[PDB]
Design an enzyme around this catalytic site. Sequence first.
Site, PDB file in Angstrom:
ATOM      1  N   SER A 177       0.807  -1.217   0.000  1.00 24.53           N
ATOM      2  CA  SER A 177       0.000   0.000   0.000  1.00 24.53           C
ATOM      3  C   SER A 177       0.843   1.271   0.000  1.00 24.53           C
ATOM      4  CB  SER A 177      -0.982   0.022   1.166  1.00 24.53           C
ATOM      5  OG  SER A 177      -0.277   0.043   2.411  1.00 24.53           O
ATOM      6  N   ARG A 232       1.643   1.881  -3.638  1.00 25.36           N
ATOM      7  CA  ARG A 232       0.463   2.195  -4.429  1.00 25.36           C
ATOM      8  C   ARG A 232      -0.272   3.437  -3.945  1.00 25.36           C
ATOM      9  NH1 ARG A 232      -0.273  -3.229  -3.266  1.00 25.36           N
ATOM     10  NH2 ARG A 232      -2.005  -2.413  -1.985  1.00 25.36           N
ATOM     11  N   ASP A 241       3.332   0.060   8.198  1.00 22.92           N
ATOM     12  CA  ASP A 241       3.844  -1.136   7.538  1.00 22.92           C
ATOM     13  C   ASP A 241       4.330  -0.762   6.150  1.00 22.92           C
ATOM     14  OD1 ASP A 241       3.944  -4.117   7.048  1.00 22.92           O
ATOM     15  OD2 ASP A 241       2.417  -3.615   5.490  1.00 22.92           O
ATOM     16  N   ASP A 269       6.012  -2.460   2.893  1.00 20.30           N
ATOM     17  CA  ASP A 269       6.309  -3.735   2.262  1.00 20.30           C
ATOM     18  C   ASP A 269       7.427  -3.612   1.243  1.00 20.30           C
ATOM     19  OD1 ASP A 269       3.985  -5.425   3.359  1.00 20.30           O
ATOM     20  OD2 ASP A 269       2.927  -3.670   2.585  1.00 20.30           O
ATOM     21  N   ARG A 300       6.367 -15.739   6.863  1.00 21.46           N
ATOM     22  CA  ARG A 300       6.822 -15.571   5.497  1.00 21.46           C
ATOM     23  C   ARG A 300       7.628 -14.303   5.267  1.00 21.46           C
ATOM     24  NH1 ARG A 300       1.555 -14.355   3.129  1.00 21.46           N
ATOM     25  NH2 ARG A 300       2.056 -15.675   1.336  1.00 21.46           N
ATOM     26  N   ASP A 307       8.529  -4.631   6.097  1.00 19.29           N
ATOM     27  CA  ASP A 307       7.974  -5.990   6.013  1.00 19.29           C
ATOM     28  C   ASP A 307       8.601  -6.583   4.751  1.00 19.29           C
ATOM     29  OD1 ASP A 307       6.527  -8.268   5.646  1.00 19.29           O
ATOM     30  OD2 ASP A 307       4.567  -7.384   5.952  1.00 19.29           O
ATOM     31  N   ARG A 328       1.995 -18.344   3.399  1.00 23.42           N
ATOM     32  CA  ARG A 328       1.788 -17.759   4.721  1.00 23.42           C
ATOM     33  C   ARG A 328       2.162 -18.736   5.838  1.00 23.42           C
ATOM     34  NH1 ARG A 328      -3.691 -14.954   7.161  1.00 23.42           N
ATOM     35  NH2 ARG A 328      -3.552 -13.840   5.152  1.00 23.42           N
ATOM     36  N   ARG A 336       2.749 -18.084  -5.614  1.00 24.56           N
ATOM     37  CA  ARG A 336       2.945 -17.077  -6.643  1.00 24.56           C
ATOM     38  C   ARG A 336       2.380 -15.723  -6.208  1.00 24.56           C
ATOM     39  NH1 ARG A 336       0.172 -20.064 -11.548  1.00 24.56           N
ATOM     40  NH2 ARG A 336      -1.164 -20.581  -9.753  1.00 24.56           N
ATOM     41  N   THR A 337       3.085 -14.649  -6.578  1.00 17.82           N
ATOM     42  CA  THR A 337       2.644 -13.279  -6.357  1.00 17.82           C
ATOM     43  C   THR A 337       3.156 -12.398  -7.485  1.00 17.82           C
ATOM     44  OG1 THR A 337       2.585 -11.447  -4.805  1.00 17.82           O
ATOM     45  CG2 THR A 337       4.684 -12.629  -4.992  1.00 17.82           C
ATOM     46  N   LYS A 375     -10.635   2.832   3.768  1.00 14.49           N
ATOM     47  CA  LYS A 375      -9.832   2.231   4.829  1.00 14.49           C
ATOM     48  C   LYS A 375      -9.969   3.022   6.131  1.00 14.49           C
ATOM     49  CE  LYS A 375      -6.006  -0.083   2.438  1.00 14.49           C
ATOM     50  NZ  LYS A 375      -4.493  -0.077   2.555  1.00 14.49           N
TER      51      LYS A 375
HETATM   52  N1  LIG Z   1       3.979  -9.758   1.695  1.00 12.44           N
HETATM   53  C1  LIG Z   1       3.510 -10.088   0.482  1.00 12.44           C
HETATM   54  N2  LIG Z   1       4.054  -9.581  -0.635  1.00 12.44           N
HETATM   55  C2  LIG Z   1       3.605  -9.884  -1.860  1.00 12.44           C
HETATM   56  N3  LIG Z   1       2.557 -10.701  -2.069  1.00 12.44           N
HETATM   57  C3  LIG Z   1       1.917 -11.228  -0.995  1.00 12.44           C
HETATM   58  C4  LIG Z   1       2.359 -10.959   0.353  1.00 12.44           C
HETATM   59  N4  LIG Z   1       1.543 -11.632   1.224  1.00 12.44           N
HETATM   60  C5  LIG Z   1       0.613 -12.247   0.444  1.00 12.44           C
HETATM   61  N5  LIG Z   1       0.849 -12.058  -0.873  1.00 12.44           N
HETATM   62  C6  LIG Z   1       0.051 -12.525  -2.001  1.00 12.44           C
HETATM   63  O1  LIG Z   1      -1.235 -12.774  -1.474  1.00 12.44           O
HETATM   64  C7  LIG Z   1      -1.640 -14.137  -1.769  1.00 12.44           C
HETATM   65  C8  LIG Z   1      -2.442 -14.649  -0.602  1.00 12.44           C
HETATM   66  O2  LIG Z   1      -1.619 -14.672   0.536  1.00 12.44           O
HETATM   67  P1  LIG Z   1      -2.269 -15.112   1.944  1.00 12.44           P
HETATM   68  O3  LIG Z   1      -1.242 -14.800   2.991  1.00 12.44           O
HETATM   69  O4  LIG Z   1      -3.660 -14.565   2.110  1.00 12.44           O
HETATM   70  O5  LIG Z   1      -2.447 -16.717   1.847  1.00 12.44           O
HETATM   71  P2  LIG Z   1      -1.449 -17.846   1.312  1.00 12.44           P
HETATM   72  O6  LIG Z   1      -1.837 -19.126   2.021  1.00 12.44           O
HETATM   73  O7  LIG Z   1      -0.042 -17.424   1.457  1.00 12.44           O
HETATM   74  O8  LIG Z   1      -1.888 -17.877  -0.203  1.00 12.44           O
HETATM   75  P3  LIG Z   1      -1.948 -19.073  -1.251  1.00 12.44           P
HETATM   76  O9  LIG Z   1      -1.636 -20.342  -0.498  1.00 12.44           O
HETATM   77  O10 LIG Z   1      -3.362 -19.043  -1.755  1.00 12.44           O
HETATM   78  O11 LIG Z   1      -0.913 -18.673  -2.300  1.00 12.44           O
HETATM   79  C9  LIG Z   1      -0.341 -14.873  -2.025  1.00 12.44           C
HETATM   80  O12 LIG Z   1      -0.508 -15.953  -2.925  1.00 12.44           O
HETATM   81  C10 LIG Z   1       0.528 -13.800  -2.652  1.00 12.44           C
HETATM   82  O13 LIG Z   1       0.197 -13.692  -4.053  1.00 12.44           O
HETATM   83  N1  LIG Z   2      -5.314 -11.719  -0.492  1.00 11.54           N
HETATM   84  C1  LIG Z   2      -4.342 -11.142  -1.245  1.00 11.54           C
HETATM   85  N2  LIG Z   2      -4.395 -11.160  -2.578  1.00 11.54           N
HETATM   86  C2  LIG Z   2      -3.448 -10.607  -3.361  1.00 11.54           C
HETATM   87  N3  LIG Z   2      -2.390  -9.919  -2.906  1.00 11.54           N
HETATM   88  C3  LIG Z   2      -2.237  -9.856  -1.575  1.00 11.54           C
HETATM   89  C4  LIG Z   2      -3.227 -10.432  -0.666  1.00 11.54           C
HETATM   90  N4  LIG Z   2      -2.793 -10.190   0.618  1.00 11.54           N
HETATM   91  C5  LIG Z   2      -1.623  -9.526   0.480  1.00 11.54           C
HETATM   92  N5  LIG Z   2      -1.317  -9.296  -0.818  1.00 11.54           N
HETATM   93  C6  LIG Z   2      -0.155  -8.603  -1.391  1.00 11.54           C
HETATM   94  O1  LIG Z   2       0.819  -8.427  -0.346  1.00 11.54           O
HETATM   95  C7  LIG Z   2       0.996  -7.009  -0.109  1.00 11.54           C
HETATM   96  C8  LIG Z   2       1.338  -6.753   1.341  1.00 11.54           C
HETATM   97  O2  LIG Z   2       0.231  -7.151   2.154  1.00 11.54           O
HETATM   98  P1  LIG Z   2      -0.302  -6.203   3.319  1.00 11.54           P
HETATM   99  O3  LIG Z   2      -1.165  -7.045   4.210  1.00 11.54           O
HETATM  100  O4  LIG Z   2       0.827  -5.390   3.874  1.00 11.54           O
HETATM  101  O5  LIG Z   2      -1.300  -5.263   2.480  1.00 11.54           O
HETATM  102  P2  LIG Z   2      -1.264  -3.721   2.035  1.00 11.54           P
HETATM  103  O6  LIG Z   2      -1.949  -3.659   0.711  1.00 11.54           O
HETATM  104  O7  LIG Z   2       0.148  -3.209   2.135  1.00 11.54           O
HETATM  105  O8  LIG Z   2      -2.206  -2.956   3.066  1.00 11.54           O
HETATM  106  P3  LIG Z   2      -1.794  -2.350   4.549  1.00 11.54           P
HETATM  107  O9  LIG Z   2      -1.860  -0.853   4.235  1.00 11.54           O
HETATM  108  O10 LIG Z   2      -2.947  -2.796   5.428  1.00 11.54           O
HETATM  109  O11 LIG Z   2      -0.440  -2.871   4.848  1.00 11.54           O
HETATM  110  C9  LIG Z   2      -0.279  -6.365  -0.625  1.00 11.54           C
HETATM  111  O12 LIG Z   2      -0.162  -4.989  -0.927  1.00 11.54           O
HETATM  112  C10 LIG Z   2      -0.543  -7.212  -1.876  1.00 11.54           C
HETATM  113  O13 LIG Z   2       0.328  -6.839  -2.944  1.00 11.54           O
HETATM  114 MG   LIG Z   3       2.761  -6.069   5.211  1.00  9.29          MG
HETATM  115 MG   LIG Z   4       1.274  -3.361   3.819  1.00  7.30          MG
HETATM  116 MG   LIG Z   5      -1.515 -21.021   1.346  1.00  6.47          MG
END
Ligand SMILES: Nc1ncnc2c1ncn2[C@@H]1O[C@H](COP(=O)(O)OP(=O)(O)OP(=O)(O)O)[C@@H](O)[C@H]1O
Ligand SMILES: Nc1ncnc2c1ncn2[C@@H]1O[C@H](COP(=O)(O)OP(=O)(O)OP(=O)(O)O)[C@@H](O)[C@H]1O
Ligand SMILES: [Mg+2]
Ligand SMILES: [Mg+2]
Ligand SMILES: [Mg+2]
EC number: 2.7.7.-
Length: 347
Positions: free
Chosen positions: A54, A57, A70, A72, A110, A122, A190, A197-198, A226
């Site tokens: 965030s 973005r 936070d 990232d 993670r 983070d 997680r 994948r991300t 928010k």
């Molecule tokens: N810190 C992060 N930075 C970038 N991408 C993230 C981050 N945390 C989560 N994601 C993205 O969010 C998705 C969902 O993460 P979440 O932690 O909700 O569950 P997960 O069990 O890790 O996901 P899944 O097993 O479905 O891949 C991840 O697959 C990844 O694409």
């Molecule tokens: N469920 C999800 N699906 C896809 N991407 C995710 C998901 N959860 C996390 N991510 C990815 O991981 C990044 C880091 O997660 P985080 O929880 O810090 O969210 P955030 O968008 O930075 O919002 P916050 O301002 O609350 O930190 C997200 O910005 C996004 O790119």
């Molecule tokens: Mg974070």
């Molecule tokens: Mg964040």
């Molecule tokens: Mg998982």
Amino acid sequence: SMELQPQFNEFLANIRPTDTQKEDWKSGARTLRERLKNFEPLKEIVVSTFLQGSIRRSTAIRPLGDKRPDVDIVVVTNLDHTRMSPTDAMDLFIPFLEKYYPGKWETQGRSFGITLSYVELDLVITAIPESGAEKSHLEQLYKSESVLTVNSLEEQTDWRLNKSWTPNTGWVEDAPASEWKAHPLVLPDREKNEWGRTHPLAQIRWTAEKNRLCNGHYINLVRAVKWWRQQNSEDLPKYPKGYPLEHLIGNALDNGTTSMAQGLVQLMDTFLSRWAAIYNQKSKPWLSDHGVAEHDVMARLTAEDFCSFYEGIASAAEIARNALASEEPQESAQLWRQLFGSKFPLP
Ligand SMILES: Nc1ncnc2c1ncn2[C@@H]1O[C@H](COP(=O)(O)OP(=O)(O)OP(=O)(O)O)[C@@H](O)[C@H]1O
Ligand SMILES: Nc1ncnc2c1ncn2[C@@H]1O[C@H](COP(=O)(O)OP(=O)(O)OP(=O)(O)O)[C@@H](O)[C@H]1O
Ligand SMILES: [Mg+2]
Ligand SMILES: [Mg+2]
Ligand SMILES: [Mg+2]
Ligand SMILES: [Mg+2]
């Protein structure tokens, strides 16, 4: 209709992270990058270190009190994810963290947390799943100014995902999808020592485009919603929040937004109509991630929380409609303050 544009601009200034916080994450991210780039044990492993989430973005809100935002960060490595596990990759960063951030870091599943003066980094360790020449071409993108900029979307509204993009000085389009769309990174799951994948770059790109299609109001509307959620936490479910909440807002908002007040009412109305059948079924939507299309952004959201959140939006939307329809600026602002609290000013 009543838009109260100057009041919304002051409100947004009050809920953005502070300039002290911003300067701390800009120096913190760049300093981390340069330290990794010159740390001999990791010099041949780290491809890129970049700002994400965030903060990148421009959808982050200021934390309350003395709480640190936070921030990232992605570290892209050239490690082979089929031969090394997520913990194998993370293991390599321990001596680095002990050298440069002793007493200030902690492993949090993670990711690594790093406490700076005004922000909390983070850090997630990632790898490029492609091999050979295909990996090399992707590495060029991760080494580009488009990726390495530490300015956020609000500061670079023309930003494009393109290795040829350069910052506008104040005085290029996205690369063709064939070069990036089907190419996510891998990151640790997680809960399990397994790669998932991300695609943060694709999410950033989508946000930038949506913001342009919405005349600069999209990222501000995410922050506003928010903030509403935070101010009404005791009357709302625990989830959605964070990125799933942002995604719901980007889905609900229509292209062409002309003001904050109009956009809030439109996105809430659309949320309620779009998800009315799902709410009636006591279910929740499945929503494709803008980064990894096959992922449901809502996968961890329960139907109970979704439906409770729908009910919260229904209550908020009535207030927002009345604020937009008000004929008196003071009444309108008092209605917005019912959603946002005292950081939304009276005219
Ligand atoms: N810190 C992060 N930075 C970038 N991408 C993230 C981050 N945390 C989560 N994601 C993205 O969010 C998705 C969902 O993460 P979440 O932690 O909700 O569950 P997960 O069990 O890790 O996901 P899944 O097993 O479905 O891949 C991840 O697959 C990844 O694409
Ligand atoms: N469920 C999800 N699906 C896809 N991407 C995710 C998901 N959860 C996390 N991510 C990815 O991981 C990044 C880091 O997660 P985080 O929880 O810090 O969210 P955030 O968008 O930075 O919002 P916050 O301002 O609350 O930190 C997200 O910005 C996004 O790119
Ligand atoms: Mg974070
Ligand atoms: Mg964040
Ligand atoms: Mg998982
Ligand atoms: Mg939409």
